[PDB]
Amino acid sequence: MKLQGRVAIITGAAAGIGFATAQRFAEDGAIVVLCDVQEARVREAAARLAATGATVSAYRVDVTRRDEVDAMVAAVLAAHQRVDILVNNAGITKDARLAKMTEAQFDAVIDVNLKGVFNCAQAVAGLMTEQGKGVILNASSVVGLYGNFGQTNYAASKFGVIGFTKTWARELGPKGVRVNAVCPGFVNTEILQTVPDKVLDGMTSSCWLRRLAEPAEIASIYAFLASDDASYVNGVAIEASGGMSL
Amino acid sequence: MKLQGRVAIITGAAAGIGFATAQRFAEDGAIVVLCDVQEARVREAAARLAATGATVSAYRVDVTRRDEVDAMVAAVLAAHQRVDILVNNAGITKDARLAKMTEAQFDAVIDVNLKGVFNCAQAVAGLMTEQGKGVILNASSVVGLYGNFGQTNYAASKFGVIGFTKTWARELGPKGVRVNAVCPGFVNTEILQTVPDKVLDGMTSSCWLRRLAEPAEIASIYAFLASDDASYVNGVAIEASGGMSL
Amino acid sequence: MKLQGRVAIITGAAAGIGFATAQRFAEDGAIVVLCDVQEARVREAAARLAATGATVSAYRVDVTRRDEVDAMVAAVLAAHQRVDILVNNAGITKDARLAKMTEAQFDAVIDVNLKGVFNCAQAVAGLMTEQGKGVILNASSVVGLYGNFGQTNYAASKFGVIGFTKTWARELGPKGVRVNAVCPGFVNTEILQTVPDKVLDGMTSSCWLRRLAEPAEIASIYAFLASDDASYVNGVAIEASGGMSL
Amino acid sequence: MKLQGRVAIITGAAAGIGFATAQRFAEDGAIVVLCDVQEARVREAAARLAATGATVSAYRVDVTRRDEVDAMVAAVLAAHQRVDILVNNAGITKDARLAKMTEAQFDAVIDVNLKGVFNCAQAVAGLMTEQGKGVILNASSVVGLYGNFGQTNYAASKFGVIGFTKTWARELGPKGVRVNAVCPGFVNTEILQTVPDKVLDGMTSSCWLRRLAEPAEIASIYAFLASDDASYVNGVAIEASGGMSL
C-alpha cells in the first residue's frame, strides 16, 4: 500500500476528480483530508470513505480565504502531526470569449485557480521542506498546454499553475519536496452530464482514445505522482487527455 | 517601411524593451502611441522619437485601471482613426521565495501582468476584428516557459500570458487578427546595471550566444511579428534568449 | 500485482534501465521477455529474475535486423500466446561534435535508435490492435527535449522517438493501444562509473533534486505507464529528470 | 536590404517553399545558390531570378550524396568566397500508417530529411564558425511538434531536425552561428493541387487563420531568421501554421 500512513490534503474533494482522488488515496492507505467549499457535501464524501475503514477528515475550505486554509492546515497538524501530500484540485470555470468576458468572470477564476493554489502550497511547503519530504500536485488542464476558445481566464490560470509547478520544483526539489502537475482532458464528471450528446461526440472524436476519462483515471495519475514510483519525477506537467487534437 | 501608417499602442514604453520597440516601430513607419505609468518619462521618450520625424503620442496608463486603458484607446481613435497593433509589454516583478512571498507581492504581479494584459487586449480586440486585421503581441519571458527560482508570481503570469496568446489566437485569428508572444531571456536594460557581476556571469554563461541581448534585439522580433512577414504566424511564443539553460 | 500475467517484451534488457524495468515488471507479475544484443549477459540477467520465481525468457535481438525481431516475436507468441507490452529501450550513443562526426557514428545511432524502435513497434502493433489492448513504451531522453552538446545523432533520434510516440498514439489509440515515451535525465547505470567526478558534479548540480536517478526510478515510470493506472495517458513524453537545467 | 551580399545556399529550391525562399532572399539582396535534385527545373528557377538582376547560381544536388553536397559547397566558395546562410528545405514524404509502412518508405524519408540535413549542415558549419558568423535554418513541420496519422517516418524526421537545431545552436552559438527551425503547417504548394476540395476544407477548418499559407509566407519567416533582426533568436523552432488543432 504505497501511500500507507501518509497525510494527504485534497482540495475540491467533495465530488469529481477530487473525490475520486480521495477515494484512491484512501485505497492506497493514505490519511486523507477532504477539503471543499461545499461543507455538507464534503462531510458526506468523507463519511463514505470512513465507512470503508479509512482514516479521513473533512473541512470546509474556500481556498481564496487564506485564514480558512491556515486553520485547516493547523487542524491537520494537530490531528496527524504532519502533511505529506497536497493535491491542489479545486478549480472553477467561467467561460466567455474575450469580446464578452466580464471583469468578475476573469477575477473569480484567477482567484480560485491561481491565488487558491498559491495559498494552499504556501501554507504547506515549509512543513514539507522542514521534514525533508513532501509532494505538491497541481491540477492544470490540457487548456494549460494549448489554450481553448472562450477560456481566457481558465487557460491563463492553468498555464499559470505550470509556472508554479516548475518554480516550486526548483525551489523545493533540493529539500526533498517534489512538485508536479496533471493536465486532464475531457473527464466524465458531473460538469459534463448536461452537455448535448452531439457535443460530447465532437469532444470524444478529438480524443485519440475516442472516449471520455472516468475520474478514477485522473485519480490514478495523482496516486502515481504522490508515490515513491515518481521519486525522480519533478517539475513536470503530465498530459492526461488520451491524446488530443484541441 | 513595413509598418507605414499603422497605429501601434505600446505599454511600458518609457524605457527598456518597450521604448526600443517604440523606436523600431517608428523606424518602420508606424504611428506610435507610447503608454507608461511613468508619465514624465514616457513624454520625454516620445519627444526623442518625434525629434527623428516620427508621429508619436504619450499617455499615462496604469494597465490595472480599465477606465484609463479605455480612455487612452478612445483618444488614439480620435487622433488616428484606428488601432492596428498592440504590444502588451508593461510588466513588473516582485520576487520572493514561496516561503516568503507576501500577498501584496503575489497580487500585484498578477494584477499588472495578467489583468493588465487582459484589459488592453479586450479594449482593442473589437476594433481589430471589426476592421478585419490587427495584431496583438504579448510580452512573456523564458520564465514563462521554464519557471525560475524566486518567481512564483512572475512565472505564473508569464505562463499565463501564453495561455492568453493561444486562446485569443483561436478566437480572433478567423477574423484576421493575429496574437503572438515573445519570451525574452536576459536583456541589457536599465534593470541590470545594479546587478552584481557574478550574477551576470551566470546569466551569460547560461546563454548559448554567451552574451546579453540589447533591447533592440527584442524590438526587432516584435517588429517582425507585427509586420506582414509574420502573416502566417499566429498563436506562437517565440523564445528570444539566444538559446539557454535556465 | 498490476501487470499479472501480462507479456512484456523489453529491448536492451541485459543491464541498466532495461534490466531494472524487467525486474520491476516481474515484481508486478508480468511475464518478461528480455532481449539484448549481448546474449550471454541477457541470459544471466533472466536467470537472476527466474531465481525470484518470475516467468522469463531471454533472446539475442539486434533491433536493426527485422528478421531477428520478427523471429523473437513469433517465439514469444508460441510460448505465451500474446504480447501485451513493448518497452523500446535499446539505444546507443556515438558522440561527436558536428565538426567531427563520422558517417558511421551518425548512421549507426539512427539505425539502432530510430529504425530499431520502428522495427519492434511494427512487429507487435498488429497483435495489439487485433486483441484490442496493448501498450508501447519508447525510451527517449531529456536530450530529446532540449538537445545536447556533442549529440547531433542521439538528439535527432530521441526527438524522433517522440515523433513516433505521438504518431502511433494517434493511429493505435482508437484501437485500444496506448503509446508513450519516457525522457530520463542522468541515471546511475554502468555507463557512469568511468565518468570523471567533475562531470558528474555538473550533472547533479543541473538536476533540481541534486542527485542522479537509480535505474529503478525510471523502471517505476515504465511500470506505471504499462499499468491500467495510465489508461488515459496516451501520446505523452514524461520527463524523468528530477527537473533540470540542461 | 537586409541580406545584402550574403551568400545563401537553399536546398529544394526549384519549386515550392524553397523557390519562394530563393526569390525572397534575392529580393533582400542575397547572393542565392539554388540547389535541387531536379536539375533542369532548378536551372530554370535560377534563370528567372537572374533576369531580375539578382546574383544567383544553380546546382543539381541530391542531399543524400555527400560528394554532391561537398562539390557544391566547394564551387560556391570558389565563386563567392564564403557561405553566410544555409536553408535546409529539401524534404520528401512517403506516408503510410505503421501497419502498412515499408522499410523503403521509412528509409527514403529518413535519408533525405535527416541524413541530407546533417550532410549540408556539416559541410558548411565549419566555414561559418571560422568566419565568426553564419546561420543555419532547418525545415521542420507542425508534424515535428504534434505528430500526424500516417507519418511515422516524416514525423520522426521533422522532430529529429529540431534535435539538430537545438544541438547545433548549443555547439555553434558561442562562435556566432545561429541555428533555428521553421515548422510550417499547410502550405499551398504544388503538393496540394490534387487534394480534394473537401479535404482542403477540413485542413483549413483546423487552422486558426482558416486558410492555407502561400509559400511566400514561409519564405518571409526564413528571411527574418536569416537577418540580423533575429540576432538573439537561436535554437528555436518557430511554428508557422496560423495556429492549428492538429
DSSP H stretches of helix in A89-150: 103-110, 116-131, 143-146
> What CATH number does residue A230 fall under?
3.40.50.720
Amino acid sitting at position C100: K
H or E segment to which residue C107 belongs: helix C103-110
Q: How are the residues of chain C apportioned to helix, strand and coil, as percentages rounded to the nearest 5?
A: 50, 20, 35
Closest CA to A114 of C202, B163, B93, B216: B163
Q: Is B8 in a helix, a strand, or coil?
A: strand
DSSP chain D: -TTTT-EEEEETTTSHHHHHHHHHHHHTT-EEEEEES-HHHHHHHHHHHHTTT--EEEEE--TT-HHHHHHHHHHHHHHHS---EEEE-------B-TTT--HHHHHHHHIIIIIHHHHHHHHHHHHHHHHT-EEEEEE--THHHH--TTBHHHHHHHHHHHHHHHHHHHHHGGGTEEEEEEEE--B-SGGGTTS-HHHHHHHHHTBTTSSPBPTHHHHHHHHHHHSGGGTT--S-EEEESSSB--
Residue corresponding to grid cell 531471454: C58
- Name the interface residues of D facing B (CB cutoff 8 Å): 166, 169-170, 173-174, 176, 178, 185, 208-210, 213, 217-218, 220-221, 223-224, 228-236, 238-243
> What residues of chain C lie within 8 A of the CB of B239, using their CB?
none
Within 8 A of D243 by CB-CB distance, chain B residues are 166, 169-170, 173, 234-236
* Phi-psi map region of B221: left, alpha, beta (phi>0 left; psi -120 to 50 alpha): alpha
Q: Positive or negative, the Cα torsion across C56, C57, C61, C67?
A: negative
Residues in chain C: 246
For residue C183, the cross-strand partners are C239
Method by which the model was determined: X-ray
Say if the Cβ atoms of B208 and D239 lie within 8 Å.
no
- Nearest CB among A107, A149, A171 relative to B98 is that of A171
Q: Which residues contact B44 (CB under 8 A, 6 or more apart)?
A: none
Instruction: Measure CA D109 to chain center.
Output: 15
Q: Is the dihedral of CA C23, C25, C29, C32 positive or negative?
A: negative
Quick one: which H or E segment has residue A178?
strand A177-184
The answer for residues whose C-beta is within 8 angstroms of residue B192's C-beta and 6 or more apart is B186, B200, B212
Question: In a 3-state reduction of DSSP, which class is residue C233?
Answer: coil
Resolution in A: 1.6
Question: Do the chains contact at B206 and C246, CB–CB below 8 Å?
Answer: no
Residue C54 zone, left/alpha/beta (φ > 0; ψ -120 to 50; rest) = beta
Q: Give residues with Cβ within 8 angstroms of B199, minimum separation 6.
A: none
First to last CA, chain B: 36
Give the whole-angstrom CA distance, residue A1 versus residue A7: 14
Alpha helices (H) in chain B, listed in sequence order: 16-27, 39-50, 66-80, 103-110, 116-131, 143-146, 152-172, 197-205, 216-226
CB D55 within 8 A of CB D32: yes
Residue D230, CB-side half-sphere exposure with 13 Å CA sphere? 32
Contacts of C245 in chain B (CB under 8 A): 146, 206, 245-246
Is residue B154 annotated as a catalytic residue, yes or no? Answer: yes
Domain count, chain B: 1
Q: In chain C, which residues touch B (CB < 8 A)? A: 146, 206, 245-246
Q: How many other C-beta atoms lie within 10 A of the C-beta of residue A29?
A: 15
- Cα separation of B233 and B227, whole Å? 10
Decide if B162 and A167 are in contact by the 8 Å CB cutoff: no
CB of C165 closer than 8 Å to CB of C181: yes
Q: What angle do CA B238, B241, B244 make, to 5 degrees?
A: 115
Residue of C27, C217, C231, C232 to mutate, testing the A interface (most A Cβ within 10 Å of its Cβ) = C232
Go through chain D and list every residue after which a break occurs, taking a C to next N gap over 2.5 angstroms, comma-separated. none
Can you give the residue range of the structural domain that contains A244?
1-246
Residue D203: φ, ψ to 5°: -65, -50
Identity (one letter) of the amino acid at B121? A
Q: Which amino acid is at C133?
A: K
Give the H/E segment covering residue C59: strand C56-60
Sheet holding A237-240, edge to edge: A56-60, A31-36, A7-11, A85-88, A134-139, A177-184, A237-240
Query: What is the distance in angstroms between the Cα of B39 and the nearest Cα belonging to chain D?
Result: 30
In one letter, which amino acid is D18? G
Evaluate whether A226 touches A88 at the Cβ level (below 8 Å).
no
Relative orientation angle of helices C152-172 and D152-172, to the nearest 10 degrees: 150
To probe the interface with A, which of D146, D148, D203, D210 has the most A CB atoms within 10 Å? D146
| Conformation bin of residue C207: beta by default, left when phi > 0, alpha when psi is -120 to 50 | beta
CB-count exposure of residue D156 (10 Å: 0-12, 13-18, 19+):
buried
Q: Report chain C residues whose CB lies below 8 A from the CB of D151.
A: 167
Q: Confirm if A70 and A46 have CB atoms less than 8 A apart.
A: no
